[PDB]
Design a protein around this ligand. Structure first.
Ligand SMILES: CCCCCCCCCCCCCCCCCC(=O)OC[C@H](COP(=O)(O)OCCN)OC(=O)CCCCCCCCCCCCCCCCC
Ligand SMILES: Nc1ncnc2c1ncn2[C@@H]1O[C@H](COP(=O)(O)OP(=O)(O)OP(=O)(O)O)[C@@H](O)[C@H]1O
Lengths: 344, 98, 171, 39, 320, 90, 46, 140, 49, 119
């Protein structure tokens, strides 16, 4: 891949969500989504192996069906009201079809089965984008219509997502599938709080992004796509444990760490709205995410696993990978609770 | 108008049903997707012509362009799948389950 | 001729049904071609000369063509599909009859609602300027060049970048 | 004595495709280390 | 500035430097054949560079102050002990084979980056494409287990295909009795305990797998001892050599760039040698590993990064 | 009604002739070609409304946009050219 | 004494200068902004 | 039309036992139909006969769960004049878990379901009485 | 006091984990499930209304 | 929520309606904490690049601290403006709707009989 191709594809990847967020016309939003899809597929398939091809095929089919359903919703609203924007008068079925489509675009349960497979078949720098930058346009389209949504189906989707994310991460031994299920869970939290306050959806979005980017960078440091491969980190690069552990605990949502605040304030709002039963279920089932993050903190930072020999030569060699953003984002994501009133 | 729109929506629903129900091929899914595209194109053009809103005619053109691009990339992916396995079958994409 | 557009929409329905049922990637192409022909015909019935002829010249002449092309060059017909083809043809018959009964029940349940069979030939054209020039569809599709240049740049960029995308996917 | 550290027996339980293989339909095997399947 | 997309866009490209003799050649053979002499002479007569055979201390010599390190810091294996007592319950055999494959791979990379940044061709001794003969020999003799062999083959599959093969492969053929005589004459109390069965397994591996596998993508040149030692014949054969049938023609500036990045990053080279397959022959315990690593970092010039060790004469550590 | 009559007549005539007839006694190059043709046919779709666009007042704008279309199409062609997409030498 | 004389053998004086200048300018602009905002606040409130 | 499931809460517990059991049985049957559809689409079977047998298994099981729960609740409220007592729903949930354990042949599942469903039904009744809302609308 | 609280928690969650992660990468099955979801949502809406 | 209100300028960090609030002081604990975070980011960068922590990259550490304090000052101004606007609107609504915010009839403990609960 040459510079011109790289520039065009990445400019499209960047432009998609920007059009989606800067356009008032649902047609232009749909355009942005299509841009994102078109420009993401090639990067997934770069390696040209069976797994990457399969992941690309699955992604394409799912996202294309979703886009078609969204465009049907738009066309129906157009026949109904003459305008190209959802108002307070659209048949709720239109908006529920739209929500189903956006949920399949994001990766929410029970529309999630494609996300772990794709992320696994895909490399690291691509999972990073797929799980951080490709959540911003479909969430924006929802933030624009939060007053006219169905709390019932939203909460069902969110709680299903929490549950399935926990019960997947409990079993997966692969970094990328673990990240996929964590994404599912946090997006469930977002959807849950959406129709009551979207500022908190955006808060949790930025928190999850700041928490995910540096984790994928940590992994890419040694291309450790597995638990038994990341356990050798104590001999390969032990100056990263003090931060991997803290970022994983923050993801889990442990009180003294940034990652807590999202759950805390979202539960607060749900209580103000009398969604206490759902808030309780979610808060109790996030502890499994915390569990299978602690199980990794163990194998990485609190106990040394059987190492290898050529790791000696790996020690001999130097390295210049981890740019400043790693430290910056990890600190901002682990030590920023005293500033919660501002982030709110 | 009501009748033709009802039938167009039923047709879109049938093509979505076809997509969500695979029958061992992949072309037979891309074709259902294109049928959906066609139904939406027709509904949009028909609403434009019914309302006499000439400020909304570019919309079919745009969606046709983008559906064409989607179909092109889908056909390329199908071509790679065939080049590797030998068939546009869906039981051969059983990887990533581990 | 009151039944004209209704017949056209019903043929479109049957074509999309023969798509939903998946005989093969080639008879599916033929079904798509028929459905598109009928779609153009109904657009012209509603007055979309440019839209319908563009469908003709681009969707069929450009899209279904490469569909069949890629199909022939990258697909093989297996002998099993013939018995199942007959089976799904019977399935299609059953679906047609089920749809007829569906339409009957919907007329019984909503006279002036879902479909006004009594007012079939009506409610096709609601209004039109009788003494008016400059009200075709090209006048609108050509707005793009003066107003709505944003759509034109969007589409041109999609097509532009598709070149790089496809060369990188195939390579 | 000294601190006990994991052994092969303790580390090879994180080496299967999935943990908790109480299933009998889980005939799977670990994926490759470079994502290039064998052929 | 470091090599990357920006350098390649600005003009630090490759095809501007691939003059004839911008090749990579191997001089393989059995153990006591004239490889060093012939390769030095070829390098001189063709203007190319010489990369001697890579052993247990290649990395220790190429990194840091250049001096060697204790075997526990580089390898924990011994060819002397391999020749004295094979079949040992320790693991020296495979723990040596793996480290030597790793060192040969690091050397192949150190040569490829040199060849791609500078058109100066390179000449090497036995490479990652032939290291496996000394493994098949041990397996057929009983010094190693099929599990070790499969581990080796897996690492080979993960590493080798991401690298370009050699242009010319010179095989100096020599028989096992002459080899034993040459050993006795040269003189080594350990090499002189080796077996003609092992030597013949090496020769058979060579002739039956290496030659066929490599004649299909690189020009082979098989010679005996007496055609060797008259090198000008070999050098003129090389100069006349035709260079088709290889992937080196399918390569453009950007494939060369994305290969130069790999070859320049000396950790994505060994990520796959460092996989956690738990063989009792290489599986080091946590206490031993921690002790060795902390002592390695205690050593000088190794505690911090290169330009940050004042105890070796590094100043300005407060502004870099 | 007239178009319908004419096309029906032609179809009838063809089928009648073909009845009397019986009753008297993988390379990616072609795919890339198809894709290029798609990307140019859609350009034709975006280019056809010029006979109606050149009747407007915003001539300085139609000039611009049509030139943009043609120029970037030519650039995409040139790139597909440089990258050996119009060669056929397998 | 190394054998692969690295990129970090000596400092990047351009980076040093730019960093120091950016820091000093940040602090100067910050002080000026703070003082101006205080003056505006007190002008508006008496 | 969704009033089949609202006729359950138009009278105190201890009355209309028959239709209340019918309602809980319909709920069980629906839940089982959905579970069986999911387990048949994902993790399918070999023969459509075995598939429909899976469906019947799950549906009849859930229907028995609901029937036993409703009947035990209303019978407890009958034998003891306490229509506003979550202990009746706890007993009904334990009976449902008992039936689940009888079907699946596992004392573990039996007792686990007992406790879990008992708490669930008791909390359901507590919500019904106090005024808890599930899926409420925004008010902030 | 082990069999009841912690061992039961572990058993329950491991079993549900196996259930939900017994998935094979079959797009047909994933899409049939998506269709069941669509049907259930349409039904919820058309029923409650 | 508060986006669609009258006198709402789009995509502006700090309007002039905010220049009337008292500005934060550089000694503010939150700015000091952001400086601490900058210093720790520098130290962590060194610790990850295998350099001497606290004896390398003084320009880098200074840049970190300066940038953190710089961003903090402005972000803090903005958040103070937002909270002030919130209070403003709330009190305005309270004053324009006296019919839904009535003063409680607060009694004295000599009148209201609270129940007693032994032990
Ligand atoms: C005040 C209010 C309280 C609020 C709540 C606070 C939350 C609790 C704070 C938790 C902070 C630490 C949590 C993460 C634990 C990290 C585990 C760890 O790093 O130790 C293991 C590892 C040992 O490495 P090993 O190979 O055994 O030998 C030493 C060689 N470094 O160690 C390492 O290798 C580290 C990398 C070596 C780098 C060189 C040494 C420089 C120092 C790095 C460690 C800095 C730790 C700072 C601790 C501050 C604690 C507040
Ligand atoms: N992979 C390996 N496994 C076991 N032994 C090896 C391996 N690679 C090299 N050796 C040992 O290294 C020794 C190489 O000695 P060699 O005779 O090659 O010296 P030399 O300097 O190359 O001289 P010449 O080039 O004339 O042979 C042999 O004894 C051989 O057994």
């Amino acid at each position: 891949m040459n510079p011109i191709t790289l520039a065009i594809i990445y400019f499209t990847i960047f432009l998609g969500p920007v059009i989606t967020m800067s356009s008032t016309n649902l047609m232009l939003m749909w355009v942005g989504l299509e841009f994102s899809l078109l420009a993401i597929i090639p990067m997934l398939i770069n390696k040209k192996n069976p797994r990457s091809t399969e992941a690309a095929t699955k992604y394409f089919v799912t996202q294309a069906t979703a886009s078609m359903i969204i465009l049907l919703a738009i066309v129906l609203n157009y026949k109904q009201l003459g305008t190209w924007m959802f108002q307070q008068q659209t048949n709720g079925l239109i908006l529920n079809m739209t929500l189903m489509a956006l949920s399949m675009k994001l990766g929410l349960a029970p529309f999630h089965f494609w996300l772990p497979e794709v992320t696994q078949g895909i490399p690291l720098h691509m999972g990073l984008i797929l799980l951080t930058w490709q959540k911003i346009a479909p969430l924006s389209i929802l933030i624009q219509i939060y007053p006219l949504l169905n709390s019932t189906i939203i909460l069902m989707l969110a709680i299903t997502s929490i549950f399935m994310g926990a019960w997947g991460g409990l079993n997966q031994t692969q970094m990328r599938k673990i990240m996929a299920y964590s994404s599912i869970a946090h997006m469930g939290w977002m959807l849950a709080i959406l129709p009551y306050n979207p500022s908190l959806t955006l808060l949790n979005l930025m928190i999850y992004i700041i928490l995910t980017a540096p984790m994928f960078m940590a992994l890419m440091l040694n291309n450790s796509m597995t638990i038994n491969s990341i356990s050798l980190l104590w001999n390969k690069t032990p100056a990263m444990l003090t931060m991997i552990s803290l970022m994983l605990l923050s993801l889990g949502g442990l009180p003294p760490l940034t990652g807590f605040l999202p759950k805390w304030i979202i539960i607060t709002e749900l209580m103000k709205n009398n969604c206490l039963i759902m808030a309780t279920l979610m808060a109790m089932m996030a502890l499994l995410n915390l569990f299978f993050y602690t199980r990794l903190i163990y194998s990485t930072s609190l106990t040394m696993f059987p190492t290898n020999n050529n790791s000696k030569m790996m020690t001999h060699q130097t390295k210049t990978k981890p740019n400043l953003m790693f430290s910056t984002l990890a600190i901002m994501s682990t030590m920023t609770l005293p500033l919660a009133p501002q982030l709110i | 108008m009501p009748s033709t729109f009802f039938n167009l929506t039923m047709a879109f629903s049938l093509s979505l049903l076809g997509t969500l129900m695979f029958r061992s091929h992949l072309m037979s899914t891309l074709l259902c997707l294109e049928g959906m595209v066609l139904s939406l194109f027709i509904m949009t053009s028909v609403t434009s012509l019914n309302s006499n809103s000439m400020s909304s005619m570019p919309i079919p053109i745009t969606i046709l362009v983008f559906a064409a691009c989607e179909a092109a990339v889908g056909l390329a992916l199908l071509v790679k799948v065939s080049n590797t396995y030998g068939t546009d079958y869906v039981q051969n994409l059983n990887l990533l389950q581990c | 001729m009151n039944n004209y557009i209704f017949v056209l929409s019903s043929l479109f329905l049957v074509g999309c049904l023969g798509l939903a049922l998946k005989p093969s990637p080639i008879y599916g192409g033929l079904g798509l071609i028929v459905s598109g022909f009928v779609g153009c015909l109904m657009v012209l019935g509603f007055g979309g000369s440019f839209l319908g002829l563009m469908v003709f010249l681009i969707y069929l002449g450009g899209m279904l063509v490469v569909f069949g092309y890629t199909t022939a060059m990258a697909t093989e017909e297996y002998p099993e599909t013939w018995g199942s083809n007959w089976l799904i043809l019977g399935f299609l018959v059953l679906g047609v009859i089920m749809e007829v009964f569906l339409i009957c029940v919907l007329n019984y349940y909503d006279e002036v609602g879902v479909i006004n069979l009594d007012g079939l030939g009506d409610w096709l054209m609601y209004e039109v300027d009788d003494v008016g020039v400059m009200l075709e569809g090209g006048i609108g599709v050509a707005a793009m060049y003066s107003c709505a240049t944003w759509m034109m740049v969007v589409a041109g960029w999609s097509l532009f970048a598709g070149i790089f995308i496809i060369i990188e996917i195939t390579r | 004595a000294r601190q006990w550290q994991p052994d092969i027996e303790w580390a090879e339980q994180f080496s299967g495709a999935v943990m908790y293989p109480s299933k009998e339909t889980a005939h799977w095997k670990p994926p490759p280390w470079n994502d290039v399947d064998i052929l | 500035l470091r090599y990357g997309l920006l350098a390649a866009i600005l003009g630090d490209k490759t095809t501007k430097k691939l003059h004839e003799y911008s090749r990579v050649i191997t001089v393989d053979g059995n153990i006591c054949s004239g490889k060093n002499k012939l390769a030095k002479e070829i390098a001189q007569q063709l203007g190319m560079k010489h990369y001697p055979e890579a052993g247990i201390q290649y990395s220790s010599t190429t990194t840091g102050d250049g001096r060697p390190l204790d075997i526990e810091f580089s390898g924990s294996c011994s060819l002397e002990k391999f020749y004295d007592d094979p079949k040992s319950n320790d693991g020296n055999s495979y723990r040596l084979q793996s480290w030597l494959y790793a060192s040969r791979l690091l050397q192949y990379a150190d040569a490829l980056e040199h060849l791609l940044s500078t058109g100066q061709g390179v000449v090497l001794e036995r490479s990652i494409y032939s290291d496996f003969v000394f493994l098949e020999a041990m397996y057929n003799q009983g010094y190693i287990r099929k599990q070790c062999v499969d581990h080796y083959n897996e690492i080979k599959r993960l590493t080798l295909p991401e690298y370009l093969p050699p242009h010319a492969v010179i095989y100096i053929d020599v028989p096992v009795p002459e080899v034993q005589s040459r050993i006795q004459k040269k003189g080594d109390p350990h090499e002189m305990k080796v077996t003609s069965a092992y030597l013949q397994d090496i020769e058979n591996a060579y002739k039956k797998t290496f030659l066929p596998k490599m004649s299909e993508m690189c020009e082979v040149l098989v010679y005996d001892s007496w055609e060797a030692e008259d090198p000008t014949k070999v050098v003129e054969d090389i100069e006349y050599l035709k260079y088709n049938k290889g992937p080196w023609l399918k390569q453009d500036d950007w494939t060369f760039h994305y290969l130069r990045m790999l070859v320049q990053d000396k950790t994505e080279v060994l990520n796959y040698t460092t996989i956690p397959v738990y063989l009792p022959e290489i599986t080091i315990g946590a206490h031993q590993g921690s002790r060795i690593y902390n002592s390695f970092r205690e050593l000088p010039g190794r505690k911090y990064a290169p330009g940050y060790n004042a105890e070796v004469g590094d100043k300005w550590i407060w502004l870099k | 009604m007239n178009l319908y009559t004419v096309i029906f007549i032609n179809i009838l005539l063809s089928l009648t002739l073909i009845l009397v007839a019986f009753w008297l006694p993988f390379s990616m190059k072609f795919f890339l070609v198809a894709i290029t043709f798609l990307l140019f046919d859609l350009e034709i779709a975006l280019l056809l409304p010029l006979p109606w666009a050149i009747q407007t007042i915003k001539t300085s704008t139609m000039m611009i946009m049509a030139f943009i279309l043609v120029t970037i199409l030519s650039l995409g062609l040139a790139y597909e050219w440089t990258q050996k997409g119009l060669e056929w030498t397998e | 004494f190394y054998v692969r004389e690295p990129v970090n053998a000596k400092p990047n004086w351009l980076a040093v200068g730019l960093s120091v200048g950016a820091s000093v300018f940040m602090w100067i602009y910050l002080i000026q902004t703070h003082n101006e905002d205080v003056l505006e606040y007190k002008r508006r409130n008496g | 039309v969704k009033r089949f499931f609202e006729s359950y809460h138009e009278v105190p517990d201890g009355t209309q036992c028959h239709r209340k059991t019918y309602i809980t049985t319909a709920l069980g049957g629906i839940c089982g139909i959905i579970g069986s559809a999911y387990s048949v689409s994902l993790n399918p079977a070999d023969s459509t006969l075995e598939a429909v047998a899976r469906v019947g298994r799950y549906t009849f099981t859930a229907a028995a769960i609901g029937a036993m729960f409703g009947l035990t609740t209303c019978v407890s409220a009958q034998v003891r004049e306490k229509p506003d007592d979550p202990l009746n729903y706890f007993i009904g949930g334990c009976a449902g878990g008992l039936t689940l354990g009888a079907r699946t042949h596992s004392y573990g599942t039996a007792a686990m379901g007992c406790v879990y469903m008992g708490t669930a039904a008791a909390l359901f009744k507590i919500g019904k009485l106090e005024g808890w809302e599930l899926f409420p609308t925004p008010k902030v | 006091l082990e069999k009841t609280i912690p061992k039961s928690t572990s058993t329950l969650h491991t079993n549900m984990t196996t259930l939900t992660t017994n998935q094979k990468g079959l797009i047909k099955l994933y899409f049939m499930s998506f269709l069941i979801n669509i049907i259930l949502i349409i039904i919820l809406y058309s029923i409650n209304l | 929520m508060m986006n669609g209100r009258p006198g709402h300028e789009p995509l502006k960090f700090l309007p002039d309606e905010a220049r009337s609030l008292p500005p934060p002081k550089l000694n503010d604990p939150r700015l000091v904490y952001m400086g601490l975070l900058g210093y720790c980011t520098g130290l962590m960068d060194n610790m990850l690049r295998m350099r001497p922590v606290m004896r390398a990259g003084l320009h880098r550490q200074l840049l970190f601290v300066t940038s953190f304090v710089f961003a903090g000052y402005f972000y803090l101004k903005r958040q103070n403006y937002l909270y002030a606007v919130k209070d403003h609107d709330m009190f305005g609504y309270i004053k324009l709707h006296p019919e839904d915010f009535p003063e409680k009839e607060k009694k004295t403990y000599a009148e209201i009989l609270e129940p007693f609960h032994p032990v």
